[PDB]
Amino acid sequence: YGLVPFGKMMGPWLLIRSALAVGGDIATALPAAVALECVQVGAMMHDDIIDCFGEPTAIVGGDGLFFHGFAALSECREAGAPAERVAQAFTVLSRAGLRIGSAALREIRMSREICSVQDYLDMIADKSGALLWMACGVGGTLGGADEAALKALSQYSDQLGIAYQIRDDLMAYNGRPTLPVLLAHERAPREQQLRIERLLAAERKAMADLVGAYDGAQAAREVSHRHVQLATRALQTLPPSPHRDALEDLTVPGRLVLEHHH
Amino acid sequence: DVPQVADPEVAAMVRAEVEGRWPLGVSGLDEVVRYGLVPFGKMMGPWLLIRSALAVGGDIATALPAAVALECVQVGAMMHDDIIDCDAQRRSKPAAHTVFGEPTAIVGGDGLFFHGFAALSECREAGAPAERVAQAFTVLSRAGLRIGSAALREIRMSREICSVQDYLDMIADKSGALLWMACGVGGTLGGADEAALKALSQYSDQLGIAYQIRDDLMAYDNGRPTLPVLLAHERAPREQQLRIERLLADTAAPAAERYKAMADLVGAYDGAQAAREVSHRHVQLATRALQTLPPSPHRDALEDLTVPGRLVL
């Protein structure tokens, strides 16, 4: 409850709150949100292909939206943004996309086999954590954030992304690895590990039966809560403000499953 | 008469920088990035940006990372365009999606794009003021929007008669924007004033038109309409115009019989030569625009790029 869950956990609210939390001006964050919208939608259109509306539009339109974001981000100077901060925003935004691309590649190469828990955690921190850091890193940078603040938002972004990707793995209760299955692997004797591995390697409703038979779902929840605490810890570096409060609640499932559908 | 500024070795310095960033043996995402980049080839886009930056008095150290940015952006666009492309004229190298699969090719194109954005961000540390780095991103992005819009139209306008001007606008975005991405970003980082940039813009559009027409001509020395076809239609009588339109209009005919039907009509109304004269006019408009730039070995290099056989994309 608290602030009622709204669904669709995206950058516009993360970016604007991040900018204002460090002392930024709304006049820059508003057009920046339009810039971030473009890049995130473009990342969406590409994600829709790799997990298999028109193929040219999905690819080129996703590409074009990357350009819209960077163009609109640069155009924020006419709104009043200092050019030095905007320049750093380019560096922030660019490295985030590199993490998203690197992670998706691992998504393709990891499927149908067990990876280490840490490997999975690093992957999603770049897959979904960078998606949020695109909002926080750009917002904070445009807001004038200190290096400690930007690093704070970085931890907050990563830890929040890990948590919510886990919470999406929990909905189920390619053979791609999820944390519940991976933590079930850790507890199991070799006899039960072998079963988990052959299944990753419609009818295979089967996987649900063996997951439930071996406590897959339960395992990941506590991991999710651990990262929720680290994200809230990171925010405390920031000065107290209503903006910092708004960021803290987003660790507890602050929006609906509709966010994972969004 | 005598040079007052240097003329450096642009082509090899660019290749050395890109090889340094993605050398032989890289793994992970850079492996797919490197696959798109190698073999390096001519890399005339990156060469054009550095010459454009130096033509206006810029720094090699500033233009070089922007040159790397260009290669990554244009190779990334090529990697995605190969996915939606169907024909392959055997004048080509294996597409990334045929080698690694379509999912990896999409990610790889994205890795190239953001490697481009990251490289262009390095211009701040290279010495460019933040004001110019931001303007470079605006120039680069708008050009990226033109090249993409043209690729979609190349797919959508093919097999139908369009106005000659509509073809000219398409090729200006397909090839003129590729040059403007080089010249516009190079000039911006080089510190070109407002008049110099518009001159470089005109040079980019006019030289891009000419390059495209020259490439349309190779078939007349994909089964898609080109300017010689459009010029032939304009000159042909109404009875011949109908046949030209119906052959384009319907996407259900054998290609070999379609092509010869178009080639006879291009030959019948001198479409090839007519295309050459259009191309020659735009080459001259390109050299005209260059005269706004100050005399230098770099401006001479841009004029030499209008010479037939020198520009390779």
Question: Between chains, do A64 and B120 touch, taking CB under 8 Å as contact?
Answer: no
Q: Which of B34, B114, B131 to mutate to test the interface with A (most CBs of A within 10 A)?
A: B114
Question: Between chains, do B111 and A95 touch, taking CB under 8 Å as contact?
Answer: no
Query: Residue A75 belongs to what domain range?
Result: 11-253
Q: Does B178 map to a domain? A: yes
Give me B247's structure tokens. 């052959």
Question: Between chains, do A55 and B83 touch, taking CB under 8 Å as contact?
Answer: yes
Q: Does B299 map to a domain? A: yes
Token pair 């291009």 is found at: B266
Q: In this structure, are residues B203 and B183 in contact, taking their beta carbons and an 8 Å threshold? A: yes
Q: Does B313 map to a domain? A: no
B94: left (phi over 0), alpha (psi -120 to 50) or beta: beta
Question: Between chains, do A97 and B113 touch, taking CB under 8 Å as contact?
Answer: yes
- Gap between the Cα atoms of A245 and A250, Å rounded: 9
From B107, B114, B137, residue closest to A71, measured CB to CB: B137
Question: Between chains, do A98 and B32 touch, taking CB under 8 Å as contact?
Answer: no
Q: Which of A46, A49, A74 to mutate to test the interface with B (most CBs of B within 10 A)?
A: A74
Q: How far is B198 from chain A (nearest CA, A)?
A: 19
Question: Between chains, do B137 and A56 touch, taking CB under 8 Å as contact?
Answer: no
Half-sphere exposure of A238 (CA within 13 A, CB side): 34
- Gap between the Cα atoms of A94 and B78, Å rounded: 20
Question: Between chains, do A98 and B84 touch, taking CB under 8 Å as contact?
Answer: no
Residues of B with CB under 8 A from a CB of A: 28-29, 32, 76-77, 80, 83-84, 101-104, 106-111, 113-115, 117-118, 120-121, 124, 129-131, 133-135, 137-138, 140-142, 144-145, 148-149, 151-152, 155
- Gap between the Cα atoms of A88 and A137, Å rounded: 10
Residues of A with CB under 8 A from a CB of B: 46, 49-50, 55-57, 59-60, 63-64, 66-68, 70-71, 73-75, 77, 83-84, 86-88, 90-91, 93-95, 97-98, 100-102, 104-105, 108
Q: Which residues of B touch A40 (CB under 8 A)?
A: none
Q: Which residues of A touch B100 (CB under 8 A)?
A: none
How would you class B254 by CB atoms within 10 Å of its CB: exposed for 0-12, middle for 13-18, buried for 19 or more? exposed
Question: Number of Cβ pairs closer than 8 Å across A and B?
Answer: 129
Q: How far is CA B255 from CA B143, B219, B233, B248, in A?
A: 33, 14, 19, 11
Q: Which residue of A has its CA nearest to B103?
A: A50
- Gap between the Cα atoms of A139 and A14, Å rounded: 8
- Which long-range contacts (C-beta less than 8 Å, at least 24 apart) are formed by B160-165? B160/B225, B160/B245, B160/B248, B160/B249, B161/B225, B161/B230, B161/B233, B161/B244, B161/B245, B161/B248, B161/B249, B162/B225, B162/B230, B164/B227, B164/B230, B164/B231, B164/B234
Find, among B199, B152, B209, B151, the residue nearest to B176 by Cα. Answer: B209
Q: Does A3 map to a domain? A: no
Q: Which residues of A touch B142 (CB under 8 A)?
A: 67, 71
Find, among A131, A152, A142, the residue nearest to A244 by Cα. Answer: A152
Find, among B201, B234, B138, the residue nearest to A70 by Cα. Answer: B138
Q: Does A4 map to a domain? A: no
Alpha-helical runs (H) found in B158-192: 164-171, 177-190
Q: How far is A16 from chain B (nearest CA, A)?
A: 21
Give me B168's structure tokens. 């000219």
Q: Does A262 map to a domain? A: no
From A64, A71, A73, residue closest to B148, measured CB to CB: A64
Give chain B's domain count: 1
Q: Does B32 map to a domain? A: yes
From A67, A100, A105, residue closest to B144, measured CB to CB: A67
Q: Does B275 map to a domain? A: yes
Question: Between chains, do B151 and A102 touch, taking CB under 8 Å as contact?
Answer: no
Q: Which residue of B has its CA nearest to A51?
A: B103
Instruction: Indicate which technique resolved this structure.
Output: X-ray
Q: Which residues of A touch B62 (CB under 8 A)?
A: none
Q: In this structure, are residues B77 and B147 in contact, taking their beta carbons and an 8 Å threshold? A: yes
From B28, B133, B151, residue closest to A60, measured CB to CB: B151
Q: In this structure, are residues B132 and B102 in contact, taking their beta carbons and an 8 Å threshold? A: no
Q: Which of A38, A66, A77, A111 to mutate to test the interface with B (most CBs of B within 10 A)?
A: A66
Q: How far is CA B244 from CA A32, A35, A68, B270, in A?
A: 49, 45, 39, 15
Q: In this structure, are residues B275 and B228 in contact, taking their beta carbons and an 8 Å threshold? A: yes
HEC states along chain A?
Answer: CCCCCCCCCCHHHHHHHHHHHCCCCHHHHHHHHHHHHHHHHHHHHHHHHHCCCCHHHHHHHHHHHHHHHHHHHHHHHHHCCCHHHHHHHHHHHHHHHHHHHHHHHHHHHHCCCCCCHHHHHHHHHHHHHHHHHHHHHHHHHHHCCCHHHHHHHHHHHHHHHHHHHHHHHHHHCCCCCCHHHHHHHHHCCHHHHHHHHHHHCCCCCHHHHHHHHCCHHHHHHHHHHHHHHHHHHHHCCCCCCHHHHHHHHCCCCCCCCHHHHC
Question: Between chains, do A63 and B109 touch, taking CB under 8 Å as contact?
Answer: yes
Read off the CATH number of the domain in which B97 is found: 1.10.600.10
